[PDB]
Design an enzyme around this catalytic site. Structure first.
Site, PDB file in Angstrom:
ATOM      1  N   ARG A 193      11.501  80.417  29.822  1.00 12.09           N
ATOM      2  CA  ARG A 193      11.259  79.618  31.015  1.00 12.09           C
ATOM      3  C   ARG A 193      11.616  80.360  32.303  1.00 12.09           C
ATOM      4  NH1 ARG A 193       7.729  77.698  28.145  1.00 12.09           N
ATOM      5  NH2 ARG A 193       8.096  75.694  27.056  1.00 12.09           N
TER       6      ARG A 193
HETATM    7  C1  LIG Z   1      10.430  75.626  33.960  1.00  8.30           C
HETATM    8  C2  LIG Z   1      10.024  74.840  32.727  1.00  8.30           C
HETATM    9  N1  LIG Z   1      10.892  73.858  32.202  1.00  8.30           N
HETATM   10  C3  LIG Z   1      10.540  73.123  31.049  1.00  8.30           C
HETATM   11  C4  LIG Z   1       9.282  73.379  30.428  1.00  8.30           C
HETATM   12  C5  LIG Z   1       8.847  72.633  29.176  1.00  8.30           C
HETATM   13  O1  LIG Z   1       9.856  71.807  28.719  1.00  8.30           O
HETATM   14  P1  LIG Z   1      10.572  72.574  27.493  1.00  8.30           P
HETATM   15  O2  LIG Z   1      11.041  74.023  27.946  1.00  8.30           O
HETATM   16  O3  LIG Z   1      11.825  71.741  26.956  1.00  8.30           O
HETATM   17  O4  LIG Z   1       9.456  72.761  26.359  1.00  8.30           O
HETATM   18  C6  LIG Z   1       8.407  74.348  30.941  1.00  8.30           C
HETATM   19  C7  LIG Z   1       7.050  74.600  30.211  1.00  8.30           C
HETATM   20  O5  LIG Z   1       6.272  75.477  30.652  1.00  8.30           O
HETATM   21  C8  LIG Z   1       8.782  75.094  32.103  1.00  8.30           C
HETATM   22  O6  LIG Z   1       7.943  76.054  32.614  1.00  8.30           O
END
Ligand SMILES: Cc1ncc(COP(=O)(O)O)c(C=O)c1O
Ligand SMILES: Cc1cc2nc3c(=O)[nH]c(=O)nc-3n(C[C@H](O)[C@H](O)[C@H](O)COP(=O)(O)O)c2cc1C
Ligand SMILES: Cc1cc2nc3c(=O)[nH]c(=O)nc-3n(C[C@H](O)[C@H](O)[C@H](O)COP(=O)(O)O)c2cc1C
Ligand SMILES: Cc1ncc(COP(=O)(O)O)c(C=O)c1O
Lengths: 214, 214
Positions: A193
């Site tokens: 992420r």
């Molecule tokens: C910054 C960010 N947070 C969360 C997510 C998705 O939620 P998770 O990481 O729990 O799958 C993404 C998915 O692209 C993301 O880019």
């Protein structure tokens, strides 16, 4: 209680990255490159972008529209001038545009002011549109509630007969908007992420550029 | 002057249609069907949706986020609570969500109020996330400008070492929002730009449903 199945949908983005040394002085140069790569990867609607407008109560609205032209003066899209978006733009010119290129692990978001295209350029474009589309422009009172689909179909046949082989005139209520480029953010997915983010911000004549935390 | 190449990109939508007799009493029933069909057509990120927020000056902002849960109480997504969207939501809870399912010739747009998830449900979800993602949540001061990517990479290694095999705690600045369902529009592309549109609007306990001109 178990989590919903979709709680588990996720993807790590490893196609690429974006570094400050990869950035051109003009954001449109990078947008052109990305758009070109989207057309090549064969996205279904590479020019589809989500435009967000705001009504008089501070409520945002969204709908997809197609990018039909772009240069330093802004990005262009065509639409019914009596529609919800047009009415919202009338009161608040501030809009946002987002190219949903996540299959390519990318996003391009633009902030700017939406202003009407000139009758002249609209005519130019309107006459390059498929004939059934020109008629359809006349048929649909975009955004207004209608009793049933039959109303549109009936009207279409009526207007098609009326226009019989002659040129379909440009409806006075059909036109478009030009969105200025005040800011442009580029997003390229990364691992853990930790994506790459660069925001171009208009500062007088130049572009202030910053990396934003993901 | 010739039109830009993209002026000619267009597609007629003939995959299907949507009639009032196809509509279930509960919009979530149709959304579930469409979502299911998106997962089957194998869209890259079937749960990806564009969320629009509005800052204090009436300027809209957009970014994609993933739908991680949904029921009658609203649609859920997780994010950094110190981010631009969270700060915008703090001042104006009104948001819009758009599922960009145009490859399937469809759109689903939702209007509602965004409110914070409880620490409890967030913890539940946070601990089902990949370990590198939990660390990454700690690393990124989402939306804030940073000097370079090295700052994130350095921090990631630092925190990974610090967390060594133990559970990665839930950062107090990481959580999520639940978006209520005030309106839900379904769009199914048609021919001659005469698409099908149905808007579900919350009216007390029931849903007022209208076809909207395309
Ligand atoms: C910054 C960010 N947070 C969360 C997510 C998705 O939620 P998770 O990481 O729990 O799958 C993404 C998915 O692209 C993301 O880019
Ligand atoms: C792939 C795709 C492309 C679209 N392009 C346009 C467009 O260029 N102009 C337009 O007016 N509507 C377009 N639409 C329909 C809009 O999404 C929207 O339903 C319509 O403009 C009415 O929005 P409004 O009621 O907010 O004014 C498109 C939809 C999709 C899914
Ligand atoms: C396919 C995809 C899924 C994403 N999902 C999320 C998400 O669920 N939560 C999140 O905080 N950011 C997510 N992002 C990153 C956001 O688009 C955005 O860059 C980030 O939340 C910061 O936005 P903000 O500065 O407006 O607050 C995703 C991006 C893509 C392209
Ligand atoms: C209502 C509407 N107008 C215009 C367009 C695209 O512009 P054009 O019809 O000139 O290709 C679309 C594309 O989906 C559309 O749905």
């Amino acid at each position: 209680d178990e989590l919903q199945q979709i709680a588990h949908l996720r993807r790590e983005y490893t196609k690429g990255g974006l570094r400050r040394r990869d950035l051109p002085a003009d954001p449109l140069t990078l947008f052109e490159r990305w758009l070109s790569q989207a057309c090549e990867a064969k996205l279904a609607d590479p020019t589809a972008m989500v435009v967000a407008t705001v009504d008089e109560h501070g409520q945002p609205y969204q709908r997809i529209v197609l990018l039909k032209h772009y240069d330093e003066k802004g990005m262009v899209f065509y639409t019914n001038l009596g529609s919800r978006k047009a009415h919202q733009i009338e009161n608040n010119p501030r809009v946002s545009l987002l190219f949903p290129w996540h299959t390519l692990e990318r996003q391009v978001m633009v902030i700017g002011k939406a202003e009407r295209l000139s009758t002249l350029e609209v005519m130019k474009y309107f006459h390059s549109r498929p004939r059934d589309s020109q008629i359809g422009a006349w048929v649909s009172k975009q955004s207004s509630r209608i009793s049933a689909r039959g109303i549109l179909e009936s009207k279409f046949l009526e207007l098609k007969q009326k226009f019989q082989q002659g040129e379909v005139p440009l409806p006075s209520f059909w036109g478009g908007f030009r969105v200025s480029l005040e800011q442009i953010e580029f997003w390229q997915g990364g691992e853990h992420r930790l994506h790459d983010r660069f925001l171009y911000q208009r500062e007088n004549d130049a572009w202030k550029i910053d990396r934003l935390a993901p």
